[PDB]
């Protein structure tokens, strides 16, 4: 699949050789073309995966993720060029270089045929994200946010490296196809229990699992808008992808090692949804929303059924799109009033009607209105959990009610009421912002029209 990798590596010198006033145009056009090219990966088979070479392969689980990455790059470019207008040309090119490198690492991560190469790329994604957050953030908390983002990740990921090299010394290969075909059960011993934990905790902290998520509100609030977009839409899904890949060698030990993570996921889902009800910062609310949805995804991956895997794939794609749209919507108001407090600017539907429509659609997809793919994933996961145990419906049921409550709370607080009297600098919505919202939302409904493209390999 070098027909996708090489054009991004060419995006790099194209950006560094462009005129000072055409960098955004060139980057956007060629990013969109690369996304169109990557659209060809959706032609998947029913039995095995597309095995391009010894190094790269495409499954029905990673193709929508690659398409989402390549589609997210141009949106980040449009979202970034507003607040980077006063920046020098060299620093703007460096920002675009960081974004391009992040896309390249993400594209290679989702198609690596070996687990060590996957590890190296999934860990290389850290440097551009950390640089973006700590260099182009606005407030002084960005440094602490970068430290939290780095060390939470590495403390989980290093035992994974040890476990991976141990597994390769034991079985002779880390190639995923060989690993799948030559799978052997895991006994019940302390060594196997700790091997399970080493293979699972890095992906758990990436989701992130409740109690291990404290880095996420910091990193997602302190980052610039493109950083938040790529952190919520793609980088959280690395944990889910890696967990569905790695669980192939963990049976039958998972049958009982999943209990603490399942309880944490369900209860912390309830807790993070409740936290969303009393939040003064508009971005932290969206971050905690992400935590709740990812807790659902964790449950689906842990119970290990075809329906749960289908629901996990659909939910990951839907959440990426929805959360990126919500972050952009909040950033528009932040750029207008230079504050993140939710109750500062109110009654915005009176001043900005079309942006209010975009807010309504985004918050409707957040609460999983049917027949959106958000609800398809959520309902598949709920059915799988009900088959796992009939008592999960209570916890799942509570979550649905709470999610609707806080979504509409956000909508009513920001759009309805009366406009604050002292704020008189609320200019009309630019064409760029409306195009950004439309390019977020239209693919969601288009995917609803044909949902088998995001349902994973278990379809």
């Amino acid at each position: 699949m070098l027909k996708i990798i090489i054009p991004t590596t060419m995006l790099l010198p194209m950006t560094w050789m462009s005129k000072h006033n055409m960098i955004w145009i060139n980057a956007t056009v060629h990013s969109l073309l690369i996304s169109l090219i990557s659209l060809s990966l959706l032609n998947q088979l029913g039995e095995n995966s597309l095995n391009f070479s010894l190094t790269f392969f495409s499954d029905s689980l990673s193709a929508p993720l690659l398409v989402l990455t390549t589609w997210l790059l141009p949106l980040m470019l449009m979202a970034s060029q507003s607040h980077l207008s006063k920046e020098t040309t060299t620093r703007k090119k460096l920002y675009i270089t960081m974004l391009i490198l992040l896309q390249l690492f993400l594209i290679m991560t989702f198609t690596a045929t070996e687990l060590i190469l996957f590890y190296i790329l999934f860990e290389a994604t850290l440097v551009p994200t950390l640089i973006i957050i700590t260099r182009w953030g606005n407030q002084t908390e960005r440094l602490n946010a970068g430290l939290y983002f780095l060390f939470y990740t590495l403390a989980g990921s290093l035992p994974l490296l040890v476990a991976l090299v141990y597994i390769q010394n034991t079985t002779g290969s880390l190639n995923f196809l060989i690993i799948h075909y030559w799978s052997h059960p895991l006994s019940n011993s302390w060594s196997n229990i700790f091997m399970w934990l080493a293979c699972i905790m890095a992906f758990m902290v990436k989701m992130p699992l409740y109690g291990l998520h404290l880095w996420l509100p910091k990193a997602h609030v302190e980052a610039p808008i493109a950083g938040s977009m790529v952190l919520a839409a793609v980088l959280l899904k690395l944990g889910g992808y890696g967990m569905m890949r790695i669980t192939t060698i963990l049976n039958p030990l998972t049958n009982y090692m999943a209990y603490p993570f399942l309880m944490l996921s369900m209860w912390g889902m309830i807790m993070t949804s409740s936290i969303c009800l009393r939040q003064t910062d508009l971005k932290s609310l969206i971050a905690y929303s992400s935590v709740s949805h990812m807790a659902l995804v964790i449950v689906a991956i842990m119970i290990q059924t075809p329906w749960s895997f289908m629901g996990a794939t659909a939910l990951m794609i839907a959440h990426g799109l929805t959360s990126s749209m919500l972050f952009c919507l909040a950033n528009t108001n932040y750029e207008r009033v230079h504050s993140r407090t939710m109750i500062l600017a109110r009654g915005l539907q009176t001043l900005l009607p079309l942006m209010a429509t975009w807010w309504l659609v985004a918050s409707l997809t957040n609460l999983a209105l049917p027949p959106s793919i958000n609800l398809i994933g959520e309902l598949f996961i709920i059915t799988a959990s009900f088959s796992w145990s009939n008592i999960t419906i209570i916890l799942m049921g509570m979550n649905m009610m709470i999610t609707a409550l806080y979504s509409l709370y956000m909508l009513i607080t920001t759009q309805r009421g009366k406009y604050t009297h002292h704020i008189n600098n609320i200019k009309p919505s630019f064409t760029r912002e409306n195009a950004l919202m439309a390019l977020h939302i239209l693919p969601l409904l288009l995917l609803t029209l044909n949902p088998k493209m995001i349902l994973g390999p278990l379809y």
């Binding site: 939290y148 404290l214 807790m271």
Partner: protein, 55 residues
């Protein structure tokens, strides 16, 4: 109670506190060769008996 205090208290704040305390313990030496040459003597004697006596 949970997100802002105890979840913070157990994993990251404890790690930071412990690392800072051990950094203070390790790095704060007066730079007098007498003290750490005495340390060298202790290390040498322990080494012969602890790891050298058992071959």
């Amino acid at each position: 109670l949970l997100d802002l205090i105890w979840l913070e208290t157990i994993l990251p704040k404890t790690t930071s506190f412990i690392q800072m305390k051990m950094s203070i313990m390790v790095s704060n030496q007066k730079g007098l060769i007498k003290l750490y040459f005495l340390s060298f003597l202790i290390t040498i004697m322990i080494s012969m008996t602890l790891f050298n006596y058992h071959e």
